[PDB]
Amino acid sequence: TLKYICAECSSKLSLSRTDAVRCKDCGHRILLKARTKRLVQFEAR
Amino acid sequence: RSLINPGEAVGIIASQSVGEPSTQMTLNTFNVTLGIPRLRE
Amino acid sequence: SSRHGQKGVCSRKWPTIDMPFSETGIQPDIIINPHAFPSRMTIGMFVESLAGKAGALHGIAQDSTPWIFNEDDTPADYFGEQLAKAGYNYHGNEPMYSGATGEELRADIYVGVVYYQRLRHMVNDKFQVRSTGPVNSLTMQPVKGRKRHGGIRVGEMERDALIGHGTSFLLQ
Amino acid sequence: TFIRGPICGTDNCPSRLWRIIDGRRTCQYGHVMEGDVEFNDDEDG
Amino acid sequence: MIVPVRCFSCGKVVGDKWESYLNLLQEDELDEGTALSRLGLKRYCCRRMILTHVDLIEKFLRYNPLEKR
Amino acid sequence: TTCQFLTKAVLDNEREQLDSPSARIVVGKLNNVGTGSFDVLAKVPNA
Amino acid sequence: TGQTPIVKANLYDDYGMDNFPNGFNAVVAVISYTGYDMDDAMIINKSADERGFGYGT
Amino acid sequence: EWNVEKFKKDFEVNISSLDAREANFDLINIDTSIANAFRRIMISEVPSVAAEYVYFFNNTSVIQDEVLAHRIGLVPLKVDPDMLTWVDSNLPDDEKFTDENTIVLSLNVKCTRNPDAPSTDPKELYNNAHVYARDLKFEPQGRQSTTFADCPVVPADPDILLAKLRPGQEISLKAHCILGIGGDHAKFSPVSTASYRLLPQINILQPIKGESARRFQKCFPPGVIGIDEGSDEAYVKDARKDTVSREVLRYEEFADKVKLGRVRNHFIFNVESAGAMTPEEIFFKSVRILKNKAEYLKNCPITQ
Amino acid sequence: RKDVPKVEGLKLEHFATGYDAEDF
Amino acid sequence: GYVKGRFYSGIKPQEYYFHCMAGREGLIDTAVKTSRSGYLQRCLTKQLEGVHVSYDNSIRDADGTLVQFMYGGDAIDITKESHMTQFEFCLDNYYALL
Amino acid sequence: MNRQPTLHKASMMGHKVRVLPNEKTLRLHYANTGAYNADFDGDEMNMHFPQNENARAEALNLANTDSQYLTPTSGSPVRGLIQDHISAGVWLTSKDSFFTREQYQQYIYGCIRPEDGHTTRSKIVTLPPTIFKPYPLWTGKQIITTVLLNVTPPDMPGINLISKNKIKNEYWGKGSLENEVLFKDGALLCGILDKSQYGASKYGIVHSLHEVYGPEVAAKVLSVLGRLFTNYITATAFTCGMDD
Amino acid sequence: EEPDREKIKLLTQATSEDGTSASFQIVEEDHTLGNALRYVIMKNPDVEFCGYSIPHPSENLLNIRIQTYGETTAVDALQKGLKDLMDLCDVVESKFTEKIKSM
Amino acid sequence: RTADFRTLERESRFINPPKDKSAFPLLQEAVQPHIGSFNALTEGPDG
Amino acid sequence: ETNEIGVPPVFAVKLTYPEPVTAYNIAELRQAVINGPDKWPGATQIQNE
C-alpha cells in the first residue's frame, strides 16, 4: 500500500484516482511523498 | 645562418608584437598623450 | 581558501604515506606553498597558524579581533609563549621528516591550524570532447553546446596565430 | 538505445539502426550509412 | 552535523568521545583542556576535532516531517 | 561594411585573384604564407 | 562537517555564526614539498579526504 | 664491506612499553630507508576489515544515505584478519561475496515517542534516539557459526555515535564488510598513527656549571637535564624524553654552549591500533610483508 | 592601553612518545 | 597618510583606513584593461596579413605590391640575433659553435 | 594547445601527448605558464588534435614549444622555471651542499632516466668526488655538472659561460665570489644559479645552451632541472615561517 | 603452471648487451621497496651505479637502474639485493620476537 | 581567558530554542533598516 | 616533459587519428582493433577500401 504524507498535519495518507489532491484531516494541499522499503546500495566511501 | 626565412609571416608577427604588449600599458599617470590612446592616433 | 584571500585549486589529492610526518606523528591536511606569501603579504595567516595551534593544545579560544594587539605587544610573542608553555617551538615550527626518503627535513617546518573554506564554484561542469558530433543545418559545421558535446571554436584570433607560425596545413 | 529505421546496406545487415558517438547512425552489426549528420541547431527575442 | 568518526589528520577514533566530553563539561565542571586529556586526545590534530565540533544535528532534528507539530 | 564592398565589387565587375589569406580561407584554397608558399613535386624514374 | 574557528573575533558569537558553520579547521603545513603546488595550487591529504574533509552535497 | 651478519651483531630492539592498543619500542642501527618502509607498510599495506558495500532498505533519518554509508565504513571492526580471504574484483556480484570473503552486518532502528515526565534530555524522551556502533548486529552467514563462535564481530569502539533519530524515522540497512588495504581507502588502515621519531642528541660543549645550569634545566623537558653541583654539572639523563623545541637556541647564554642534532640510526616507533589487532602484531605483519614483497620479486621471471 | 591578558595556568601538553605525565 | 606601522606588528586604525584607500585605486584600473587593444590588433592583422618574406628577401604583400626590400634593413630574424653581437661568448665557445 | 585569448602565436603551441591514468584534467608543466600567460586557478585550454601528416609534421617542427623559446618581440626567452625550482638551486648549488655517494647517484637518476631517452650515452657517466680522504663527498655544483654532462651530446665540448647572479656577494660573507657564475668546459665552477640563469632570463645558462647546442638540448635541460629541483625539494624541503 | 610476467620487466632499450647495466621496471611499487632495495643493492662491492625513480605519481611504476663494474651482471646483482633484504627482515623479526618474550 | 567558544551554551540552545526572546540580538538589528521601512507603511503616526 | 601535455583517459579514448594500415604498422594496429574503444591503446572504427 503506497502512501503519501500531508506536509501540515503529518498524517499518512494514500491517494486514489478521482480524488482532490488534499489532506483529508486538515485541508492542506502540499502533500509530500513518503519513502517505502526499497533497496539502494552504496560504496562505503 | 641567422637570416629570416622566405615565406615567414612577418606581417602577422609585427602586428602581434605591437598588439600584445599593448595589453600591458593600460594603466594611468604614475602633457603628452599616453599609451594606447596615443597608439590609436 | 583560508580567511585571508589565499585561495588555490586542489592540484593533487596526495597520498598519505609520502607526505611529511612530524615528531608528534601528525601529518598535515593541507600543504600550502610558501611562495604564495611574499607577493600577497598575508601575515594574518602566519599569525593564525600559531594561534590555532596554541588554542588546540591548551583547549582555549583566542580572540582575533583587529587592533587588540599593539607594536609593543606583538602576537608572535603573545601566542608564541603559549606554544613554549606546551613544550613546542616558540616560532610555530615543528620538526618534520620525509614521507618518501624517511630522512629528516632540512629546517623545521612551519605547521599550525588554519580555518579553511570551500568555494561553491567547482570544475565539474567544464570539460568537453568532440569527435564527430551533430552539425548545423545551414553551414554543415559543428554545433555549439556542451549539452550536445561539440563545437570548440577556432576563432578570429586563433586563425592569426596559425598564420603567424606559417603553418599552412594546420590552418587548412 | 536502438531506433528502428530502414534496412541497411552492405548486403550484410538487414537490421534496425542506432546512433553512434554524438553524430551518426550505425546498424548494430557495425556498418554505418552515409549522410547521417543529425542536423541539430544552435540557440542564439 | 554529527561528530566525525575518525580524526581527519591522524585517524584516531573520535566519534565515541562526544557524549563523554559533554559530561566532562557539565557534570565535572572541567575546562576544555582537562576534559580532552582525560578522554585521551593528546595530539593537537585530534584535540581540535572534539574541541571544535558544532553538533548541528540537534538543530536539524527539530524539523521532523513524520510527526505532528 | 560587407555589402558596401560587395556592391562595389559587382559594379566594378571584379575578378578576385584569391591570394590574400582572407580570400583563400573563404573559398577553401590553401594559404600561401609559409609552407603554402611553394609547390612540392615528386620525381618519378620511368619516362 | 562544519566546525567553529579556534581563531575568531568576538563578533562571531554576537551574530551567532555558529548556527551557520562556514568552514573547518585544518592542520596546515607551509612547505614546498611535493612540487605540485605553485601559482596558487594546494595539496590536500588523501586520507584526510577519504575520512571526510570539506565534504558537501 | 657490509654484511647481513654485521647487521645482526649490532641491531637492538628496546621496547619501552606495550599496551593492548599502543606499543612503543626503539630500533637501533638500522637505516632510515628501511625503518621508513616499516612505517610505510603499517599504514598502507597491512590489511584490515572494513565495511565496503552498504545496502539501505529504508533510511528516513536526517543524515543522508551516502553520508551514513560513509560513517559505517569508518567504524573499525574487531575482526582478526587471516580469517577472511581476499574478494575477487573481476568476478560478478552473484559470485563475489561468499561466506569466506565477507562479513554481513545489519542495523534496524526505529525511533518512537516515550511517555515521560518533563528541555528534557532525548535519552529520557525518545526510544532509540541515538544509534551507536554496537547496534551493528553481526549476522553469521554461511559456515561462519562454527568459526566465529569464539570471536563474534563487534566494533572495536562500540560507542561510536552513528546517527540520531526522532520518532517516525528509521534506518534499516545491511552492510557487507570486506578485507582491504589502507592504501586504497583510509578506512582499512589498521593503525591510528604508526610513526617514528629520531633520537635527539644534546651535545654540551663548554661546562655550564652553576646557576646557568638551572636555566639550562628549563630549556628542556624535566626528565632531560640533571644537576648536582659544579661537579656533575649538567648531564643528559634521558634524551628520549626531549621534544625538539629549540628553546635553548634562543638564549644568548647558550647559543655557543650546545648543539642539537639527532642520533641518525636510533628510531623511536610509536604504533597505535584501530583495535582489530595488537600493535606489536601489526609490526610483525609489516616486517613480513616487506620480506614477502621481496620474495615475490626474487622468485619471478623476466621476459623481454 | 592594557596589554592583552595572559591566560594563567598553562602547562606542558606535548611530551615525547611513550611519556605521558611523568614530570613533577 | 604616512603609515609607520608594518605588517609584522600591525597598522593602527587610522593608517589601516588609508591603506584601504590605496588598495582601491588600483582596482578601478581592473575593468578598464579589457577591451583596450582588442580592436587595435584586429585592425592591424587584417592589413599586415598577406605580408610575407619572398625568396628574394623582399617584404611583399600577398598581391605582390612591394612593401620593403629587406626585413628591418638586414633580413635577420629577431629570434636569431640574440648572441649575434655577443662576440666574447662566441670566442670562448669557438670549437663548440664551429 | 590553446589558451583562449590568443594575443600572440606563442599562445598556441604544439605539445607532445603523454596519456596519464587516473586524472580528470589536462596537466601542464610550469615552464609553459609564461608562454600561454596562465595562472593555475581554473584556466581552460583548448586541445586541438590534427588529423593528417601534413599537420603532424608542422606541429612537430614549426609550432612546437621547443622552437618557441625566444619570443619574436625582442628575442627574449619566455620559458623557464618559475617559483620553487628557483629557490632550490640557491640551496643545491650552494657551498654547504655536500652529498654522499648514495645520495649523488640518486639525484642523477631521479632527474635523468636513460630509458626515456634523456642520456646521450646509453649509460650514466659520473664524476670523481671533490673530497677523498675523511669520507667521499660530492658538492652540489657537481650535480649540475653531471646533468649537463649527460644531456649534452658527447662530441661537442662543454659550455664556457661567464655571467652574474641576482644575489650579491656580501650576502654570503667575506671574500665570497658566489655572484660570478662560471662554467668552464661544461662544469659549474663558481656561483649559485637563480632566476637569472634558468629562469626566463636572457644570457643565462639555459639561454646559452639554446645558442650553442640548439633548441632540443635547451628543452631537455629545463626538463632535467625541473625534476632535479623537485626531487631535491622532496628530500630537503623549503618553508617560510614566523621567525623569517 | 602460472608465473607472473607483469611484475618485473627489464627494459632492453637501456640494458647493456654486456648485461652489466640494466634498468628494470616494477609495477605496483614505489618508495616503499624501491628505497629499501636501493640501500641494500649499494652495499654490493661490485655495484657502480644504483638509483630508483618513479616516473610519475599517477601510475604505480618503479624504475631501478643497476650498473656494475664487471664480473657480475645487474640481474645477478638485483637478486643479491633481494636476498639480503630478505635476510635483513628475518633479523629484525628475530630480534623483535625476543624482546616481546623478554617482558 | 581571552575568548571562549560556548560549547555547552550552544548545545543547550540547539536542543532548546528560546521560548521568550531571540538570542543574538545584533542579527535582528542588521535588517531593522529593511523591516522598519516596511513597518512605516502601516504603522506610526497618521496610520 | 616541458614539451608535453598530460591527457586524461577520458579525453584519450575519444579522440581518434586515422592511421592507414601498411606493412610496418600492422603489428601495432592489430593490437588496436583487439583492444577496442574501452582499453586505451586501441581503436574505435576501421574504414574499408
mmCIF file with all atom_site columns, N, CA, C and O in Angstrom, chain A residues 35-42, chain H residues 54-60 65 104-108 139 170-176:
data_model
loop_
_atom_site.group_PDB
_atom_site.id
_atom_site.type_symbol
_atom_site.label_atom_id
_atom_site.label_alt_id
_atom_site.label_comp_id
_atom_site.label_asym_id
_atom_site.label_entity_id
_atom_site.label_seq_id
_atom_site.pdbx_PDB_ins_code
_atom_site.Cartn_x
_atom_site.Cartn_y
_atom_site.Cartn_z
_atom_site.occupancy
_atom_site.B_iso_or_equiv
_atom_site.pdbx_formal_charge
_atom_site.auth_seq_id
_atom_site.auth_comp_id
_atom_site.auth_asym_id
_atom_site.auth_atom_id
_atom_site.pdbx_PDB_model_num
ATOM 1   N N  . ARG A 1 35  ? 8.757  7.716   1.720  1.00 0.00 ? 35  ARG A N  1
ATOM 2   C CA . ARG A 1 35  ? 9.629  6.701   1.162  1.00 0.00 ? 35  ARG A CA 1
ATOM 3   C C  . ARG A 1 35  ? 9.237  5.344   1.706  1.00 0.00 ? 35  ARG A C  1
ATOM 4   O O  . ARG A 1 35  ? 8.827  5.213   2.863  1.00 0.00 ? 35  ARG A O  1
ATOM 5   N N  . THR A 1 36  ? 9.343  4.351   0.845  1.00 0.00 ? 36  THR A N  1
ATOM 6   C CA . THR A 1 36  ? 8.951  2.993   1.152  1.00 0.00 ? 36  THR A CA 1
ATOM 7   C C  . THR A 1 36  ? 10.182 2.106   1.186  1.00 0.00 ? 36  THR A C  1
ATOM 8   O O  . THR A 1 36  ? 11.298 2.541   0.912  1.00 0.00 ? 36  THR A O  1
ATOM 9   N N  . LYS A 1 37  ? 9.960  0.852   1.542  1.00 0.00 ? 37  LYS A N  1
ATOM 10  C CA . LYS A 1 37  ? 11.040 -0.106  1.714  1.00 0.00 ? 37  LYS A CA 1
ATOM 11  C C  . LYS A 1 37  ? 11.546 -0.547  0.349  1.00 0.00 ? 37  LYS A C  1
ATOM 12  O O  . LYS A 1 37  ? 10.843 -1.249  -0.381 1.00 0.00 ? 37  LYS A O  1
ATOM 13  N N  . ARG A 1 38  ? 12.760 -0.134  -0.007 1.00 0.00 ? 38  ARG A N  1
ATOM 14  C CA . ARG A 1 38  ? 13.274 -0.374  -1.344 1.00 0.00 ? 38  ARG A CA 1
ATOM 15  C C  . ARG A 1 38  ? 14.790 -0.288  -1.320 1.00 0.00 ? 38  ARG A C  1
ATOM 16  O O  . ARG A 1 38  ? 15.355 0.596   -0.676 1.00 0.00 ? 38  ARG A O  1
ATOM 17  N N  . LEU A 1 39  ? 15.437 -1.195  -2.042 1.00 0.00 ? 39  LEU A N  1
ATOM 18  C CA . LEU A 1 39  ? 16.876 -1.384  -1.928 1.00 0.00 ? 39  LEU A CA 1
ATOM 19  C C  . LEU A 1 39  ? 17.644 -0.394  -2.786 1.00 0.00 ? 39  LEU A C  1
ATOM 20  O O  . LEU A 1 39  ? 17.523 -0.405  -4.014 1.00 0.00 ? 39  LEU A O  1
ATOM 21  N N  . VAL A 1 40  ? 18.462 0.438   -2.145 1.00 0.00 ? 40  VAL A N  1
ATOM 22  C CA . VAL A 1 40  ? 19.524 1.178   -2.814 1.00 0.00 ? 40  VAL A CA 1
ATOM 23  C C  . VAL A 1 40  ? 20.839 0.754   -2.186 1.00 0.00 ? 40  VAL A C  1
ATOM 24  O O  . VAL A 1 40  ? 20.859 0.188   -1.089 1.00 0.00 ? 40  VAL A O  1
ATOM 25  N N  . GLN A 1 41  ? 21.933 1.008   -2.882 1.00 0.00 ? 41  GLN A N  1
ATOM 26  C CA . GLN A 1 41  ? 23.225 0.487   -2.480 1.00 0.00 ? 41  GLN A CA 1
ATOM 27  C C  . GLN A 1 41  ? 24.298 1.554   -2.618 1.00 0.00 ? 41  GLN A C  1
ATOM 28  O O  . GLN A 1 41  ? 24.188 2.490   -3.407 1.00 0.00 ? 41  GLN A O  1
ATOM 29  N N  . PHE A 1 42  ? 25.345 1.408   -1.817 1.00 0.00 ? 42  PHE A N  1
ATOM 30  C CA . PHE A 1 42  ? 26.394 2.407   -1.735 1.00 0.00 ? 42  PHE A CA 1
ATOM 31  C C  . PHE A 1 42  ? 27.725 1.711   -1.549 1.00 0.00 ? 42  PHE A C  1
ATOM 32  O O  . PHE A 1 42  ? 27.813 0.651   -0.930 1.00 0.00 ? 42  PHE A O  1
ATOM 33  N N  . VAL H 2 54  ? 27.212 -0.985  1.293  1.00 0.00 ? 54  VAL H N  1
ATOM 34  C CA . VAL H 2 54  ? 26.145 -0.732  2.244  1.00 0.00 ? 54  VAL H CA 1
ATOM 35  C C  . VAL H 2 54  ? 24.836 -0.745  1.483  1.00 0.00 ? 54  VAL H C  1
ATOM 36  O O  . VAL H 2 54  ? 24.691 -0.039  0.484  1.00 0.00 ? 54  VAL H O  1
ATOM 37  N N  . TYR H 2 55  ? 23.894 -1.562  1.937  1.00 0.00 ? 55  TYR H N  1
ATOM 38  C CA . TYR H 2 55  ? 22.623 -1.777  1.257  1.00 0.00 ? 55  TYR H CA 1
ATOM 39  C C  . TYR H 2 55  ? 21.526 -1.213  2.143  1.00 0.00 ? 55  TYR H C  1
ATOM 40  O O  . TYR H 2 55  ? 21.166 -1.823  3.147  1.00 0.00 ? 55  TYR H O  1
ATOM 41  N N  . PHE H 2 56  ? 20.993 -0.056  1.782  1.00 0.00 ? 56  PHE H N  1
ATOM 42  C CA . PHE H 2 56  ? 19.898 0.508   2.548  1.00 0.00 ? 56  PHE H CA 1
ATOM 43  C C  . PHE H 2 56  ? 18.579 -0.094  2.111  1.00 0.00 ? 56  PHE H C  1
ATOM 44  O O  . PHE H 2 56  ? 18.343 -0.335  0.927  1.00 0.00 ? 56  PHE H O  1
ATOM 45  N N  . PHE H 2 57  ? 17.711 -0.329  3.075  1.00 0.00 ? 57  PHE H N  1
ATOM 46  C CA . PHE H 2 57  ? 16.334 -0.648  2.745  1.00 0.00 ? 57  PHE H CA 1
ATOM 47  C C  . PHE H 2 57  ? 15.397 0.504   3.021  1.00 0.00 ? 57  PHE H C  1
ATOM 48  O O  . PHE H 2 57  ? 14.500 0.764   2.223  1.00 0.00 ? 57  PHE H O  1
ATOM 49  N N  . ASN H 2 58  ? 15.607 1.220   4.117  1.00 0.00 ? 58  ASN H N  1
ATOM 50  C CA . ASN H 2 58  ? 14.849 2.428   4.401  1.00 0.00 ? 58  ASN H CA 1
ATOM 51  C C  . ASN H 2 58  ? 15.681 3.268   5.350  1.00 0.00 ? 58  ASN H C  1
ATOM 52  O O  . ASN H 2 58  ? 16.010 2.815   6.446  1.00 0.00 ? 58  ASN H O  1
ATOM 53  N N  . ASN H 2 59  ? 16.043 4.467   4.914  1.00 0.00 ? 59  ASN H N  1
ATOM 54  C CA . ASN H 2 59  ? 16.710 5.457   5.748  1.00 0.00 ? 59  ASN H CA 1
ATOM 55  C C  . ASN H 2 59  ? 15.871 6.717   5.681  1.00 0.00 ? 59  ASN H C  1
ATOM 56  O O  . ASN H 2 59  ? 15.899 7.423   4.671  1.00 0.00 ? 59  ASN H O  1
ATOM 57  N N  . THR H 2 60  ? 15.147 7.017   6.749  1.00 0.00 ? 60  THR H N  1
ATOM 58  C CA . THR H 2 60  ? 14.253 8.164   6.733  1.00 0.00 ? 60  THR H CA 1
ATOM 59  C C  . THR H 2 60  ? 14.736 9.216   7.726  1.00 0.00 ? 60  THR H C  1
ATOM 60  O O  . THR H 2 60  ? 14.050 10.207  7.973  1.00 0.00 ? 60  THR H O  1
ATOM 61  N N  . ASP H 2 65  ? 21.991 9.280   2.964  1.00 0.00 ? 65  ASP H N  1
ATOM 62  C CA . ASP H 2 65  ? 22.300 7.874   2.812  1.00 0.00 ? 65  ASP H CA 1
ATOM 63  C C  . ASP H 2 65  ? 23.747 7.653   2.434  1.00 0.00 ? 65  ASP H C  1
ATOM 64  O O  . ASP H 2 65  ? 24.359 6.701   2.915  1.00 0.00 ? 65  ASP H O  1
ATOM 65  N N  . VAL H 2 104 ? 28.727 -9.913  7.084  1.00 0.00 ? 104 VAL H N  1
ATOM 66  C CA . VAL H 2 104 ? 27.491 -9.180  6.882  1.00 0.00 ? 104 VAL H CA 1
ATOM 67  C C  . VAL H 2 104 ? 27.058 -8.617  8.224  1.00 0.00 ? 104 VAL H C  1
ATOM 68  O O  . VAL H 2 104 ? 26.856 -9.368  9.185  1.00 0.00 ? 104 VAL H O  1
ATOM 69  N N  . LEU H 2 105 ? 26.929 -7.299  8.298  1.00 0.00 ? 105 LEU H N  1
ATOM 70  C CA . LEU H 2 105 ? 26.331 -6.636  9.440  1.00 0.00 ? 105 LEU H CA 1
ATOM 71  C C  . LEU H 2 105 ? 24.962 -6.100  9.042  1.00 0.00 ? 105 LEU H C  1
ATOM 72  O O  . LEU H 2 105 ? 24.608 -6.064  7.865  1.00 0.00 ? 105 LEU H O  1
ATOM 73  N N  . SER H 2 106 ? 24.182 -5.665  10.026 1.00 0.00 ? 106 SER H N  1
ATOM 74  C CA . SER H 2 106 ? 22.874 -5.088  9.745  1.00 0.00 ? 106 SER H CA 1
ATOM 75  C C  . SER H 2 106 ? 22.513 -4.124  10.860 1.00 0.00 ? 106 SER H C  1
ATOM 76  O O  . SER H 2 106 ? 23.181 -4.054  11.889 1.00 0.00 ? 106 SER H O  1
ATOM 77  N N  . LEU H 2 107 ? 21.425 -3.400  10.648 1.00 0.00 ? 107 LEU H N  1
ATOM 78  C CA . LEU H 2 107 ? 21.011 -2.340  11.555 1.00 0.00 ? 107 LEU H CA 1
ATOM 79  C C  . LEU H 2 107 ? 19.542 -2.067  11.301 1.00 0.00 ? 107 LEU H C  1
ATOM 80  O O  . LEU H 2 107 ? 19.165 -1.797  10.164 1.00 0.00 ? 107 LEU H O  1
ATOM 81  N N  . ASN H 2 108 ? 18.717 -2.146  12.340 1.00 0.00 ? 108 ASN H N  1
ATOM 82  C CA . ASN H 2 108 ? 17.281 -1.920  12.182 1.00 0.00 ? 108 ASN H CA 1
ATOM 83  C C  . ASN H 2 108 ? 16.807 -1.142  13.402 1.00 0.00 ? 108 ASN H C  1
ATOM 84  O O  . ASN H 2 108 ? 16.470 -1.745  14.423 1.00 0.00 ? 108 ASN H O  1
ATOM 85  N N  . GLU H 2 139 ? 25.527 -10.867 11.595 1.00 0.00 ? 139 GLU H N  1
ATOM 86  C CA . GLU H 2 139 ? 24.706 -11.953 11.092 1.00 0.00 ? 139 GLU H CA 1
ATOM 87  C C  . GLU H 2 139 ? 25.603 -13.028 10.510 1.00 0.00 ? 139 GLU H C  1
ATOM 88  O O  . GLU H 2 139 ? 26.146 -12.840 9.412  1.00 0.00 ? 139 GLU H O  1
ATOM 89  N N  . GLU H 2 170 ? 13.375 6.025   10.713 1.00 0.00 ? 170 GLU H N  1
ATOM 90  C CA . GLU H 2 170 ? 14.025 4.743   10.904 1.00 0.00 ? 170 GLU H CA 1
ATOM 91  C C  . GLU H 2 170 ? 15.230 4.633   9.991  1.00 0.00 ? 170 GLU H C  1
ATOM 92  O O  . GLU H 2 170 ? 15.373 5.370   9.018  1.00 0.00 ? 170 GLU H O  1
ATOM 93  N N  . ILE H 2 171 ? 16.107 3.696   10.329 1.00 0.00 ? 171 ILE H N  1
ATOM 94  C CA . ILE H 2 171 ? 17.217 3.298   9.475  1.00 0.00 ? 171 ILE H CA 1
ATOM 95  C C  . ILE H 2 171 ? 17.182 1.784   9.393  1.00 0.00 ? 171 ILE H C  1
ATOM 96  O O  . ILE H 2 171 ? 17.079 1.115   10.424 1.00 0.00 ? 171 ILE H O  1
ATOM 97  N N  . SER H 2 172 ? 17.254 1.237   8.183  1.00 0.00 ? 172 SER H N  1
ATOM 98  C CA . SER H 2 172 ? 17.287 -0.214  8.040  1.00 0.00 ? 172 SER H CA 1
ATOM 99  C C  . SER H 2 172 ? 18.251 -0.588  6.932  1.00 0.00 ? 172 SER H C  1
ATOM 100 O O  . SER H 2 172 ? 17.955 -0.363  5.758  1.00 0.00 ? 172 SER H O  1
ATOM 101 N N  . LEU H 2 173 ? 19.378 -1.187  7.293  1.00 0.00 ? 173 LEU H N  1
ATOM 102 C CA . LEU H 2 173 ? 20.443 -1.388  6.326  1.00 0.00 ? 173 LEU H CA 1
ATOM 103 C C  . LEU H 2 173 ? 21.086 -2.750  6.530  1.00 0.00 ? 173 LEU H C  1
ATOM 104 O O  . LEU H 2 173 ? 20.739 -3.500  7.442  1.00 0.00 ? 173 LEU H O  1
ATOM 105 N N  . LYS H 2 174 ? 22.041 -3.059  5.654  1.00 0.00 ? 174 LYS H N  1
ATOM 106 C CA . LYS H 2 174 ? 22.734 -4.341  5.683  1.00 0.00 ? 174 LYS H CA 1
ATOM 107 C C  . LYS H 2 174 ? 24.066 -4.133  4.966  1.00 0.00 ? 174 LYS H C  1
ATOM 108 O O  . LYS H 2 174 ? 24.089 -4.001  3.744  1.00 0.00 ? 174 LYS H O  1
ATOM 109 N N  . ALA H 2 175 ? 25.154 -4.089  5.727  1.00 0.00 ? 175 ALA H N  1
ATOM 110 C CA . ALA H 2 175 ? 26.453 -3.720  5.184  1.00 0.00 ? 175 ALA H CA 1
ATOM 111 C C  . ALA H 2 175 ? 27.337 -4.945  5.019  1.00 0.00 ? 175 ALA H C  1
ATOM 112 O O  . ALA H 2 175 ? 27.433 -5.771  5.928  1.00 0.00 ? 175 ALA H O  1
ATOM 113 N N  . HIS H 2 176 ? 27.977 -5.061  3.861  1.00 0.00 ? 176 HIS H N  1
ATOM 114 C CA . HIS H 2 176 ? 28.945 -6.122  3.632  1.00 0.00 ? 176 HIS H CA 1
ATOM 115 C C  . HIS H 2 176 ? 30.349 -5.640  3.950  1.00 0.00 ? 176 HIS H C  1
ATOM 116 O O  . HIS H 2 176 ? 30.809 -4.632  3.413  1.00 0.00 ? 176 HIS H O  1
#
